[PDB]
Write a protein that binds this ligand. Structure first.
Ligand code: ANP
Ligand code: MG
Lengths: 17, 299
């Protein structure tokens, strides 16, 4: 997995492991 | 800035041909302007007060800076109005990059590895777009394979400006903990625990280095472990190297220049561009044609 967004959110988006 | 209330219905001006992308938020389609037949990409995102600042930031960036030939060119923005029991949708209409992303390309290449000459060409194109943004005091903040696209002619275009930053001075700094862990520079990661830490354009250069490794090895360093683990080992681990000794000494030296952990010893965008891996390169048109040919074969 995932990517870091604003305000303490994440979303699926490049990774995991 | 952009005002979302002034956007009009796309009516039947564009038809969505097929889905080509899903990144962080929304979906990208191959779009077709029905009168002229012209192709465009159409990023479709539900409008919501929760996502609206990110949507506006990307639209303003594209309006102001996508005229450069290494950024996907902005065409316009519409809003599909939907009945009262259904969110409205924003259509962001831009230049269609017909060959997909660099990640796409690495996935469909045998052995998930690019020829070094293609890596050098792509990196120089990324560096040129970055150089344009950095001169305009913009930090991209999400440089990675998924956000670097290829046209049908193997031209290179940056996309995805949702979390980019607009600075006021050349020297200006930022301190927002944001990005994809594997591509994040140490000085960006430092803003998690250190409230006094800051970074600037040089963080895009680190991400470019991780992207070159991604093109060389099929994945960024540390992708065998979960992203939490990688976030805490990137500052402690020595800077990543190419593992194979078969790459040229030029390419190895370039990776070494991109990935200086101590960002004040990391070269600026302009010094990095004179690096012989970037500078001493065969004709743009020659390498491009070979890459265009490989994209078509594997399609
Ligand atoms: N102009 C385009 N032409 C072709 N495919 C595209 C284009 N723009 C985006 N895509 C595809 O759709 C994917 C997601 O697009 P992006 O603009 O990266 O969306 P996101 O990751 O949802 N962006 P953001 O929410 O602003 O951080 C890209 O990785 C490409 O695969
Ligand atoms: Mg993206």
């Amino acid at each position: 997995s995932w990517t870091i967004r604003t305000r303490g959110r994440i979303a699926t988006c490049s990774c995991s492991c | 800035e952009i005002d979302l209330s002034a956007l009009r219905d796309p009516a039947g001006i564009f038809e969505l041909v097929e889905l080509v992308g899903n990144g962080t938020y929304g979906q990208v389609y191959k779009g077709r302007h029905v009168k002229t037949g012209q192709l465009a990409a159409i990023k479709v995102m539900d409008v919501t007060g929760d996502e609206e600042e990110e949507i506006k930031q990307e639209i303003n960036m594209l309006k102001k800076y996508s005229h450069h030939r290494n950024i996907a060119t902005y065409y316009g923005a519409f809003i599909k109005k939907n009945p009262p029991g259904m969110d409205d949708q924003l259509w962001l209409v831009m230049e269609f990059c017909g060959a997909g992303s660099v990640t796409d390309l690495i996935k469909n290449t045998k052995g998930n590895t690019l020829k070094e000459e293609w890596i050098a060409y792509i990196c120089r194109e990324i560096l040129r777009g970055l150089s344009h943004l950095h001169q305009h005091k913009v930090i991209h903040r999400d440089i990675k394979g998924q956000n670097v696209l290829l046209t049908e002619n193997a031209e290179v275009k940056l996309v995805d400006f949702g979390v980019s930053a607009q600075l006021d001075r050349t020297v200006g700094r930022r301190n927002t903990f944001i990005g994809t862990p594997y591509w994040m520079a140490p000085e960006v990661i430092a803003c998690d625990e250190n409230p006094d830490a800051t970074y600037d354009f040089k963080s895009d250069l680190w991400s470019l280095g991780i992207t070159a490794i991604e093109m060389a090895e099929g994945a960024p360093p540390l992708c065998d472990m979960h992203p939490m683990r990688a976030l805490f080992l990137i500052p402690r681990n020595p800077a990543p190297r190419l593992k194979s000794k078969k790459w040229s000494k030029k390419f190895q030296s370039f990776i070494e220049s991109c990935l200086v952990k101590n960002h004040s010893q990391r070269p600026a965008t302009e010094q990095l561009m004179k690096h012989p891996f970037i500078r001493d390169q065969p004709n743009e048109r020659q390498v491009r044609i070979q890459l265009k040919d490989h994209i078509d074969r594997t399609k």
